[PDB]
Amino acid sequence: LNYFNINYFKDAASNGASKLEFTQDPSKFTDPVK
């Protein structure tokens, strides 16, 4: 259900994978128009 998540290094690159966010569903590819 839950889990711990602590960063130990001072650099951001040193951290792990980024948290999945969104997919930006609106696709300008399907309908390339204003």
């Binding site: 259900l1 839950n2 889990y3 650099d11 951001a12 690159a13 040193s14 951290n15 792990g16 994978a17 980024s18 948290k19 999945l20 969104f22 997919t23 590819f29 399907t30 309908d31 390339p32 128009v33």
Partner: protein, 280 residues
């Protein structure tokens, strides 16, 4: 509420399916015009009678972080030691580029620009050509552009005043370190339509120059003959991308170039012929 969903990977839900009834009207959603360069928006509940279904799939595995966040080999370096002229030979130099392994190159060349952080892991192997190996130690140093490049095993450049280095010895685990996004521009170039200041070197051979990676054996003279092979793996983090491109269809020939011609060879793709088109 947020730990539970991501632990169960239940983010990025998919729309459900609604029931429909027979219809007869003037509006025809099935008809459209494809000359506009647009994609049709017809859904299954517009041309057939459907049933109410509660979908349960989630599109988390098709995200960019999941797709590009896997380790893969990008280089293999072989070093053979010689017991004659010990202080002259026994070092290697390689120029960094992600364009020498088919799988990684084809996976990353699906877009035009990208921006990410890197993670590097090394897998050293020792081959014994004598009765014993003994004690073996190795050093790897990163040389940014403009820094002096060593040309001998005992060069003064190995002191590593500011350059980053790592050490490995037999019986130790696999080394690993991280790198940030290191480019002059705001993104990486996988395709470049341009030249240099002398109107030469068409392609990406000029924009991408990240330096070199050097290695040597630190152990002094001994009486053992060995070979060292090291493999480098790379994985991307915090990924962004722009402008997708069609996938590659033929085999690669050269780095930083898109040439595909091969001497005394016909063009071969993944399409398989058929005897007749009326029989599947």
């Amino acid at each position: 509420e947020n730990y539970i969903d991501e632990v169960l990977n239940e983010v990025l839900v998919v729309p459900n399916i609604n029931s429909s009834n027979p219809t007869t009207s003037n509006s025809a959603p099935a008809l459209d015009a494809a000359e506009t360069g647009h994609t049709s928006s017809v859904q299954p509940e517009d041309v057939i009678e459907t049933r109410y279904v509660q979908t349960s799939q989630t599109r988390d595995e098709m995200s960019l972080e999941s797709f590009l966040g896997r380790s893969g080999c990008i280089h293999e370096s072989k070093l053979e030691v010689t017991l004659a002229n010990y202080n002259k030979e026994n070092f290697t130099v390689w120029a960094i580029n992600l364009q020498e392994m088919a799988q990684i190159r084809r996976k990353f060349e699906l877009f035009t620009y990208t921006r990410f952080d890197s993670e590097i892991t090394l897998v050293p192997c020792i081959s014994a050509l004598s009765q014993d190996i003994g004690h073996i130690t190795m050093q790897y140093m990163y040389v940014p552009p403009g820094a002096p490049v060593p040309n001998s095993r005992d060069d003064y450049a190995w002191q590593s005043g500011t350059n980053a280095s790592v050490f490995w010895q037999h019986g130790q685990a696999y080394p690993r370190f991280s790198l940030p996004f290191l480019s002059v521009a705001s993104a990486y170039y996988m395709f470049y339509d341009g030249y240099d200041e002398q109107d030469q070197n068409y392609g990406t051979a000029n924009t991408n120059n990240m330096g070199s990676l050097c290695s040597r054996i630190v152990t002094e003279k001994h009486i053992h003959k060995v070979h060292i092979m090291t493999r480098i793996y790379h994985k991307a983090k915090h990924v962004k991308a722009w402008c997708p491109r069609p996938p590659r269809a033929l085999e690669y020939t050269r780095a930083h170039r898109t040439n595909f011609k091969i001497e005394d060879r016909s063009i071969q793709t993944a399409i398989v012929t058929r005897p007749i088109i009326t029989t599947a």
